[PDB]
């Protein structure tokens, strides 16, 4: 037939135009994301220097510095995106999460998870697992308040495991967690993006070898640590968004490149069919005319 070919040609052309426009828009957004991400370095460096200098002459004792004596359970947090067409970004994140789950399964500890993003939330919803809480709607453009509240909730959950023995929550009243994990993706290069999972719940000290504290040094230390946790949580989001957009661009590029060849092949088929039809018609009419 002929009409179907023309319809598919028109549809493919429209699709190619739309994909090209989307790719150009994503390439435009990449620069703004890169400009935004690199603005948190000075505060992080100064807060790290402050914490190190304060803890240098301070006592080493804190619930975030001490460990639970028993392996009860371990929490985990998984990041994701809020839109599709991202490529293998979600697949890589989920595979890293699954391999981390397999690694923690060897210790017999039942894990608990927190999810951010609609896609991963739905993917785990289809699967049979528990979700304590879900945060959605701000992956494209993050801000400090969400990171602060996430850090506060996670720190409170960690603090709720002071005397959790067996199934007994103790004086806490609620069964708590004993370990936390972070899974995300970093920004190695414009074309290098690898998923990374790291552990950051209990702090640890390494001596590298070899002021005046007006308020209580212990009070300053205890007040300062949550700020450090919140700053790290905030620093995660910008890298996540930049990696997501960088992964997004190539998908549109390859989509347009693959869409062109369909147009080419359909054009060839249409031309062949037209030639066959006209030659058949002329053969039939001449054969009919000559017979008389």
């Amino acid at each position: 037939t002929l009409r179907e070919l023309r319809g598919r040609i028109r549809s493919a052309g429209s699709i190619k135009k739309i994909t090209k426009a989307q790719e150009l828009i994503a390439t435009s957004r990449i620069a703004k994301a890169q400009a935004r991400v690199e603005a948190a370095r000075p505060y992080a460096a100064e807060i790290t220097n402050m914490l190190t200098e304060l803890a240098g002459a301070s006592a080493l004792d804190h619930p975030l510095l001490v460990e639970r004596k028993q392996p009860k359970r371990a929490g985990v947090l998984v990041v994701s995106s809020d839109r599709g067409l991202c490529g293998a970004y979600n697949a890589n994140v989920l595979r890293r999460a699954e391999e981390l789950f397999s690694l923690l399964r060897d210790e017999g500890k039942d894990p608990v998870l927190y999810v951010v993003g609609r896609k991963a939330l739905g993917y785990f919803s289809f699967r049979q697992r528990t979700v304590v809480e879900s945060w959605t709607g701000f992956s494209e453009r993050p801000t400090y308040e969400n990171a602060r509240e996430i850090a506060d909730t996670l720190v409170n959950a960690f603090m709720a495991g002071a005397d959790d023995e067996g199934d007994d929550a103790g004086a806490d009243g609620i069964l708590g967690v004993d370990e936390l994990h972070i899974v995300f993706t970093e920004f190695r290069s414009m074309l290098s993006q690898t998923a990374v999972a790291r552990r950051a719940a209990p702090m640890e000290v390494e001596y590298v070898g070899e002021y005046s504290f007006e308020p209580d040094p212990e009070t300053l230390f205890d007040a300062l640590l949550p700020r450090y946790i919140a700053t790290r949580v905030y620093a995660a989001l910008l890298e996540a968004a930049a990696s997501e957009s960088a992964s997004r661009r190539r998908a549109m590029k390859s989509a347009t490149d693959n869409a062109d060849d369909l147009i080419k092949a359909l054009t060839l088929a249409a031309n062949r069919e037209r030639q066959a039809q006209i030659t058949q018609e002329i053969s039939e009419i001449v054969g009919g005319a000559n017979a008389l």
Binding site: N92, L191, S192, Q193, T194, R250, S254
Partner: protein, 68 residues
């Protein structure tokens, strides 16, 4: 008709020639029904599994943009 009557064929396409390689021989289509008696025993012994390796290389090259 001609490919049906004869046995074996060699395919030459414009894509590789335009790319820059002068001898333009495809690896996934050119199959010859000739037996192994044509090649000398030394030739058969020294060279083997070339076509499958080239086919899998032509399959892998499509993902040169993803090294992860």
């Amino acid at each position: 008709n001609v490919i049906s009557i004869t046995d074996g064929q060699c395919f030459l396409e414009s894509d590789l020639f335009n790319q820059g390689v002068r001898p333009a021989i495809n690896v996934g289509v050119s199959v010859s029904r000739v037996g192994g008696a044509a090649q000398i025993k030394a030739m058969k012994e020294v060279a083997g599994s070339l076509r499958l390796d080239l086919s899998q290389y032509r399959e892998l090259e499509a993902f040169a943009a993803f090294a992860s």
